Ligand binder design. Structure first.
Ligand SMILES: [Mg+2]
Length: 221
């Protein structure tokens, strides 16, 4: 049976994406650009901070100096760090706490395999830190899209081979990263968005220990 579960943060454990939307909107207002709304924020999903900022400037066909660009980018991040002080245990997605408890009670290792620069802080805010055996550090290993490195680091950090591990992800490039790590992916979301070949659940409430087991046993057969 699998010895570890490697968790993505955003889309699996919780939603960081709403706080980002509020950070960008605050910057947009602050510099006087209309049109940053939930509809527009959807075009920032999986987009770099620098690309996202450029798209916001494009709303007013605005050109800024490289130094100004850099200061706006920084301020969005400051806004974000400010927004996320309100993260709490109410942000934890359904099923996730029970899963962590069940994994832990069965001595299965729990690692975070996230590109989030605020991972440890966010796990603290959500009161999940005690369940986590390691957090892979994205500053040390490339967690840039589809790189298995973050997943490989997360497995190793709890003393297992990726081959002994399940990875949970909500994005196609996440699922690819898990596969190239040698871990077994289980996706959360819509068939249409993730892939033909992999097991997928429609939401995090379906991530149960019993279900992960059944999937591990059907990989092995
Ligand atoms: Mg994600």
């Amino acid at each position: 049976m699998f010895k570890a579960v490697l968790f993505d943060l955003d889309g699996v454990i919780t939603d960081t994406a709403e706080y980002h939307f509020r950070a960008w909107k605050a910057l947009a207002e602050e510099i006087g650009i209309n049109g940053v709304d939930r509809q527009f924020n959807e075009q920032l999903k999986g987009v770099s901070r620098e690309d996202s900022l450029q798209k916001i400037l494009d709303l007013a066909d605005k050109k800024v100096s490289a130094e100004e660009f850099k200061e706006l980018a920084k301020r969005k991040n400051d806004n974000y760090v400010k927004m996320i002080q309100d993260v709490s245990p109410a942000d934890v997605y359904p099923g996730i706490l029970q899963l962590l408890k069940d994994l832990r009670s069965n001595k299965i290792k729990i690692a975070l395999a996230s590109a989030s620069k605020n991972g440890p802080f966010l796990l603290e805010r959500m009161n999940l830190t005690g369940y986590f055996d390691a957090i892979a550090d994205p500053a040390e290993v490339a967690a840039s899209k589809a790189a298995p490195d973050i997943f490989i680091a997360a497995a190793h950090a709890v003393g297992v081979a990726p081959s002994e591990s399940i990875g949970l992800e909500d994005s196609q490039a996440g699922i690819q990263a898990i596969k190239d790590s040698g871990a077994l992916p289980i996706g959360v979301g819509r068939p249409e968005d993730l892939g033909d070949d992999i097991v997928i659940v429609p939401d995090t409430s379906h991530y149960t220990l019993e279900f992960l087991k059944e999937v591990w046993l059907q990989k092995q057969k």
